[PDB]
Curated annotation (Swiss-Prot), chain A:
Gene Ontology biological process terms in this record: 2-oxoglutarate metabolic process; female gonad development; glutathione metabolic process; glyoxylate cycle; isocitrate metabolic process; NADP metabolic process; NADPH regeneration; regulation of phospholipid biosynthetic process
Binding positions (NADP(+)): 71-73, 78, 256, 306-311, 324
Alphabetical list of Pfam families matching this protein: Iso_dh
Gene from which the chain derives: IDH1
Compartments reported by the entry: Cytoplasm, Cytosol; Peroxisome
Residues that bear N6-succinyllysine: 122, 394
Record's subunit section: Homodimer.
Protein name (record): Isocitrate dehydrogenase [NADP] cytoplasmic
Cofactor: Mg(2+); Mn(2+)
Taxonomic lineage: Eukaryota, Metazoa, Chordata, Craniata, Vertebrata
InterPro entries: IsoCit/isopropylmalate_DH_CS, Isocitrate_DH_NADP, IsoPropMal-DH-like_dom
Keywords per UniProt: Acetylation, Cytoplasm, Glyoxylate bypass, Magnesium, Manganese, Metal-binding, NADP, Oxidoreductase, Peroxisome, Phosphoprotein, Tricarboxylic acid cycle
Amino acid sequence: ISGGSVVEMQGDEMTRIIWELIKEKLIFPYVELDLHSYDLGIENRDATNDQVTKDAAEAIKKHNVGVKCATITPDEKRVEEFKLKQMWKSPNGTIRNILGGTVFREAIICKNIPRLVSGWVKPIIIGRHAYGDQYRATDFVVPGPGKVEITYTPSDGTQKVTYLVHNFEEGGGVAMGMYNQDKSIEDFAHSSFQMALSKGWPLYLSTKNTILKKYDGRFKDIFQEIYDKQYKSQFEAQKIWYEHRLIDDMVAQAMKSEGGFIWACKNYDGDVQSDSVAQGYGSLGMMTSVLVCPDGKTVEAEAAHGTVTRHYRMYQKGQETSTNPIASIFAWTRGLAHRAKLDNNKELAFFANALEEVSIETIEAGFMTKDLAACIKGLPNRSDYLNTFEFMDKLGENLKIKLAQA
Amino acid sequence: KISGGSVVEMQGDEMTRIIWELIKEKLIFPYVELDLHSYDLGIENRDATNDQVTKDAAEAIKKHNVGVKCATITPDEKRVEEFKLKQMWKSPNGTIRNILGGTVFREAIICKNIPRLVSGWVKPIIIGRHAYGDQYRATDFVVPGPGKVEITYTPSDGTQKVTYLVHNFEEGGGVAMGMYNQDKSIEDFAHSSFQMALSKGWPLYLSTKNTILKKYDGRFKDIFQEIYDKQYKSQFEAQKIWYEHRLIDDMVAQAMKSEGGFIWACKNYDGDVQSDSVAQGYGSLGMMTSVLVCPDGKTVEAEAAHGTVTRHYRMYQKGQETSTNPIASIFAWTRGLAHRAKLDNNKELAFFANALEEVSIETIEAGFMTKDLAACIKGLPNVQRSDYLNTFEFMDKLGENLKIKLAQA
Ligand SMILES: [Mg+2]
Ligand SMILES: [Mg+2]
């Protein structure tokens, strides 16, 4: 299959290893691609002073489809490990801040994988605003007594306003400024309403506008305006609704619901609650994560659950590993699925969906990695699972079998 | 009657205000005479006093050491129109908490017969919510158009002014905000967290996002680790427990799959969010205690961790039957009275407070409960009217069982 142009972002440690096997055994044997590869490995980002992160983001803007491997965001320990020049910032934040949009996250559900939350019989889709707030903030330590202020200087000559954040009288502490943008919020709202109409489900927006009356009130107002002016009639035609809820009420409503709704989250809440939801369905790694940009055509699919450092340690030590590749697989299929839509590549669309089916049916047939065997029988309880290479070998077979019968 | 002593009462709003009176009339006043210092924190009285009554109540809590608070309305624009308010008043919980300081400890109220929504939580989860700063003392504003937003720090000793660019709005407007926290408050927060873990014999976890907020959240992580290494590590090892810092998103996942049995120190915002998640995970927002424990070790503010339950209130004012779980509000009283008794060595009052808590749990375990807990047993689509009691019917049964239990003692 002539898949077309796709931007690839290589990753780190075990996810890097799986990334290549995904390419060699599941994608390349059936799809020919005009790949634009950017190596976002921790060592290459350091070598390029993180410019490669900036380059890849622009390439996605240029070619409209990116697929990203899990990467390391370095901490103190990692700076020493790789002797890094700086503690480089999260490349996910960099890419999202450049492209903007909404990261849609949803569990990857298998019949035989137990949930931790009893009632979630329908999926929950979180729309995480991908821009601003804590992820582009300016925080600093306050070393001692002093005055912390935040000021806004209008460009049209209107008066500068100054607000007291806090007067530190006896000691120091911490302070920080953050922001968000009307246009970004408007895109976030449009993406949320359109996702609800596509799935035929109600939409909920969570904020804390009772406490952040101006900051979070802006989110509430923009959503309600766009709803009243542009979507209410469409929602009523489909027998769905939109509601704003305070964040603490919303997570409780989600916990007790049956699923089957779209959940628009501010950036920070989307990060936190998407991991809570993913784990609630059975496994934190069984999740899709696709950034949908405002233009409606540009997309970045990713594996969101970081690397598997302990698996990498054994892999290079020669010890057998059993690492779950599903999320990395679904970053590809979701990217290829979008590639097909942009190009009307019906052949690629079938392949993308076929591979997702093969992954689910393979696991639902009892062939799975150690991660899922523990979910079923509990970690304390080799014959129950397949090692990394053995599992991917099986997916290759069922994919070739499934594709042949066509 | 039992001589209860001095207690600061804060009256509330909507459904919790209605329940608040039933608790006093049916469960407290018939058995306890109190020197109550009542402050009406109803939205309309706060507006009339320009929110001064909220500040007065906070200082009264400092004076009498025991406060019990009904849920209140924090108004937004819609609430200003509803009540024709002078201003969009700030959360009185934030005002009280910022004045007194300390840690809000929240935990589910567990009944044998109530199924959970989270499978593994066989041990309790206790959240220690930092009660000071962050979003609850922030300075936010709308950015009407293009312009430059900066945040600056001016030392009081005349040293260099430090200026940071927050963002330059080039096309259109948006929102901006400043936030802060204080070393001493974090230090108190850490001490209260380590001491709670040692008291319960459980490990402690602190959740932050220091990978993104390297300075802001890193300060929390560093202060906790310093105080731990210098003052608590040895005690933790003696009891076979531990302390570790975790990323917030990692932590909520860890908690979801855990079996419980740990202390969870949360920044102010995270404590609010996750306390509702945890309470619902164990079964119901109404089955949770919430007590602000101040640094002095003597002052206390007991509350119900949930809101004023507006949606239930709308039906009540329509004259319709409602079924709102009052246990959390009841336990705000018992927890406050229990602390009042401890400070006063009031063995009779201490017995009463504990007796009512036992009656609350025993009544539910005997099959008498509100609709929320009935749904926990039989999926909400399957609940029938015969499976639960309305709010007043439930309180009547607690009154009867309380009368019985107190007689037999
Ligand atoms: Mg995350
Ligand atoms: Mg709350």
